[PDB]
Design an enzyme around this catalytic site. Structure first.
Site, short mmCIF file in Angstrom:
data_model
loop_
_atom_site.label_atom_id
_atom_site.label_comp_id
_atom_site.label_asym_id
_atom_site.label_seq_id
_atom_site.Cartn_x
_atom_site.Cartn_y
_atom_site.Cartn_z
N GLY A 1 -8.54 -6.54 9.44
CA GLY A 1 -7.40 -5.84 10.00
C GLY A 1 -6.98 -6.35 11.37
N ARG A 2 -7.68 -5.91 12.41
CA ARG A 2 -7.33 -6.31 13.76
C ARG A 2 -7.31 -7.82 14.01
NH1 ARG A 2 -11.19 -1.62 16.01
NH2 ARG A 2 -12.21 -2.34 14.08
N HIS B 1 -3.23 4.38 -1.66
CA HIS B 1 -4.00 4.79 -0.48
C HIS B 1 -4.75 6.09 -0.75
CE1 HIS B 1 -5.50 5.18 3.42
NE2 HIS B 1 -4.44 4.88 4.14
N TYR C 1 -5.74 11.00 4.00
CA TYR C 1 -4.36 11.24 3.60
C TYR C 1 -4.34 12.10 2.33
CZ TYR C 1 -3.43 8.29 7.51
OH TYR C 1 -3.42 7.80 8.80
N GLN D 1 0.87 -1.17 0.00
CA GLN D 1 0.00 0.00 0.00
C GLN D 1 0.91 1.22 0.00
OE1 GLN D 1 -2.22 1.66 3.44
NE2 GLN D 1 -4.08 1.39 2.20
N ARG E 1 -7.52 1.94 -2.63
CA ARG E 1 -8.38 1.92 -1.46
C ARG E 1 -9.02 3.30 -1.31
NH1 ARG E 1 -7.69 0.01 5.00
NH2 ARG E 1 -9.30 -1.59 4.72
N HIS F 1 -8.95 7.51 4.06
CA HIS F 1 -8.67 7.91 5.43
C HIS F 1 -8.04 9.28 5.71
CE1 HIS F 1 -8.60 3.25 6.04
NE2 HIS F 1 -9.80 3.71 5.77
C1 LIG Z 1 -3.20 -0.64 14.09
C2 LIG Z 1 -3.93 -0.09 12.85
C3 LIG Z 1 -3.26 0.39 11.76
C4 LIG Z 1 -3.91 0.72 10.50
N1 LIG Z 1 -3.15 1.11 9.42
C5 LIG Z 1 -3.73 1.16 8.22
C6 LIG Z 1 -2.94 1.42 7.01
O1 LIG Z 1 -1.70 1.47 7.01
N2 LIG Z 1 -3.65 1.77 5.90
C7 LIG Z 1 -5.08 1.67 5.78
O2 LIG Z 1 -5.58 1.92 4.70
N3 LIG Z 1 -5.82 1.46 6.92
C8 LIG Z 1 -5.21 1.11 8.05
N4 LIG Z 1 -5.95 0.72 9.15
C9 LIG Z 1 -7.36 0.36 8.93
C10 LIG Z 1 -7.49 -1.13 8.64
O3 LIG Z 1 -6.98 -1.50 7.37
C11 LIG Z 1 -8.98 -1.56 8.67
O4 LIG Z 1 -9.68 -0.94 7.55
C12 LIG Z 1 -9.70 -1.29 9.98
O5 LIG Z 1 -8.90 -1.76 11.10
C13 LIG Z 1 -11.09 -1.86 10.09
O6 LIG Z 1 -11.06 -3.29 9.90
P1 LIG Z 1 -11.06 -4.32 11.10
O7 LIG Z 1 -12.34 -4.11 11.89
O8 LIG Z 1 -11.10 -5.71 10.37
O9 LIG Z 1 -9.81 -4.14 11.92
C14 LIG Z 1 -5.35 0.54 10.44
C15 LIG Z 1 -6.04 0.13 11.61
C16 LIG Z 1 -5.39 -0.27 12.78
C17 LIG Z 1 -6.19 -0.75 13.97
O1 LIG Z 2 -3.04 5.38 12.92
N1 LIG Z 2 -2.46 4.89 11.96
O2 LIG Z 2 -1.22 4.77 11.97
C1 LIG Z 2 -3.15 4.80 10.68
C2 LIG Z 2 -2.39 4.81 9.46
C3 LIG Z 2 -3.11 4.71 8.20
C4 LIG Z 2 -4.56 4.61 8.13
O3 LIG Z 2 -5.12 4.54 7.02
C5 LIG Z 2 -5.24 4.61 9.42
N2 LIG Z 2 -6.69 4.51 9.49
O4 LIG Z 2 -7.37 5.23 8.82
O5 LIG Z 2 -7.21 3.58 10.07
C6 LIG Z 2 -4.55 4.70 10.65
#
Ligand SMILES: Cc1cc2nc3c(=O)[nH]c(=O)nc-3n(C[C@H](O)[C@H](O)[C@H](O)COP(=O)(O)O)c2cc1C
Ligand SMILES: O=[N+]([O-])c1ccc(O)c([N+](=O)[O-])c1
Length: 362
Positions: free
Chosen positions: A321-322, A179, A184, A98, A231, A182
């Site tokens: 994600g989580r 990306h 950015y 990404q 995304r 969110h």
């Molecule tokens: C620790 C953390 C870091 C994340 N970093 C990213 C990321 O680098 N890029 C992104 O597009 N979203 C990021 N997200 C969002 C996740 O990709 C995901 O869309 C979100 O956690 C909801 O899905 P989940 O309920 O399955 O965790 C992040 C979320 C968490 C909790």
């Molecule tokens: O907090 N983070 O580092 C982080 C980075 C990229 C992301 O896209 C997100 N987010 O939207 O969930 C969170």
């Protein structure tokens, strides 16, 4: 059950529809924003995923907004990523990188020359980013007010995305994910709330989407359309960035434009971590009939919800994600209906092996 059936995703074929969502973990080496052997092990442990989408990675030094996030612009970074993709491939997996530019969700202390970060306009994100303290520990810090990009600076941004994709190809990645969500940089231009420009990059939805579409065209030309994914988070509010008063119409316009390029996939982040209104089936149908590639749904999904929507033919795969942070073998667990490891949120960002590579497989 359909979550465990093959799916053609652009140039590759996923053996299942359980994807690993992009997750920023902030464990890269500084100076250099270099991926590490530990990160390689983390991704290797999760190689059974239908597709692994990496943590957000910088297209340039200016793109940096978080201490600990990796880049894909220097020789050292490319060499490190090559080892990581090789590890995933050694386990018969597939991995997409990404790519992002954080724009205003950044801080001057980690910008080139320690200067203010850039955005569509000079408006503070009014949120926080993550830096590191004197001991290397992650810390939250208010974002720095950005400088509005000059019109003649736009081609440079497009070129950085282009070069990063060329670098991704050499680094061994199977696909790239832009990306554009969110809050950015790309989303900063897409949203009226963060874009008050009066040139051709602001105003109408056509103008607001101009940048992301120039980037899509540039990366498709650099590599191939079947290697490109994107995304978006077009409905609702994410990290203080909403999608305007006509979000549904604007979203459909963007999707129709993306479809013209015939890219590999459309990844829809449906809700912010703090929640949001759910997508209606009518909206899902309108999205589905406008895009001809793979559609990935994400945002607090349950296996049951994934099966329901894939069965209704509205989406093709789901990104978790989580659950992937805490379960390297999530695919096997969901397939066997086994219990999952409990999540430890305090170690999501920064640190080392603890809370990163210490979640056991069955
Ligand atoms: C620790 C953390 C870091 C994340 N970093 C990213 C990321 O680098 N890029 C992104 O597009 N979203 C990021 N997200 C969002 C996740 O990709 C995901 O869309 C979100 O956690 C909801 O899905 P989940 O309920 O399955 O965790 C992040 C979320 C968490 C909790
Ligand atoms: O907090 N983070 O580092 C982080 C980075 C990229 C992301 O896209 C997100 N987010 O939207 O969930 C969170």
């Amino acid at each position: 059950e359909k979550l465990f059936t093959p799916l053609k995703v652009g140039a590759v074929t996923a053996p299942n529809r359980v994807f690993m969502a992009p997750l920023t973990r902030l464990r890269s080496i500084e100076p250099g924003d270099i991926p590490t052997p530990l990160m390689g092990e983390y991704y290797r442990q999760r190689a059974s995923a239908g597709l692994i989408i990496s943590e957000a990675t910088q297209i340039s030094a200016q793109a940096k907004g978080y201490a600990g996030a990796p880049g894909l612009h220097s020789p050292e970074q490319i060499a490190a990523w090559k080892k990581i993709t090789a590890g995933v491939h050694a386990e018969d997996g597939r991995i997409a990188v990404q790519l992002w530019h954080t724009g205003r969700i950044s801080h001057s202390s980690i910008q080139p020359g320690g200067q203010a970060p850039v955005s569509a306009s000079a408006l503070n994100a009014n949120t926080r980013t993550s830096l590191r303290d004197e001991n290397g520990n992650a810390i939250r810090v208010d974002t720095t007010t950005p400088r509005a990009l000059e019109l003649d600076e736009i081609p440079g941004i497009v070129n950085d995305f282009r070069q990063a994709v060329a670098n991704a190809r050499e680094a061994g990645f199977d696909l790239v994910e832009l990306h554009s969500a969110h809050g950015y940089l790309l989303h900063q231009f897409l949203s009226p709330s963060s874009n008050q420009r009066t040139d051709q990059y602001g105003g109408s939805v056509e103008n607001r989407a101009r940048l992301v579409l120039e980037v899509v065209d540039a990366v498709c030309n650099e590599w191939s359309a079947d290697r490109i994914g994107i995304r978006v988070s077009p409905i609702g509010t994410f990290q203080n960035v909403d999608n305007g008063p006509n979000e549904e119409a604007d979203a459909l316009y963007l999707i129709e434009e993306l479809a013209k390029r015939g890219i590999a996939y459309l990844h829809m982040s449906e809700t912010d971590l703090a929640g949001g209104k759910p997508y209606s089936e009518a909206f899902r149908q309108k999205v589905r009939e406008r895009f001809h590639g793979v559609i990935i749904g994400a945002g607090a999904y349950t296996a049951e919800k994934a099966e329901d929507l894939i069965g209704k033919g509205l989406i093709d795969a789901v990104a978790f994600g989580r659950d992937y942070i805490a379960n390297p073998d999530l695919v096997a667990r969901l397939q066997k209906k086994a219990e999952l490891n409990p999540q430890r949120p305090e170690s999501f960002y920064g640190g080392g092996a603890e809370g990163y590579t210490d979640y056991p497989s069955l």
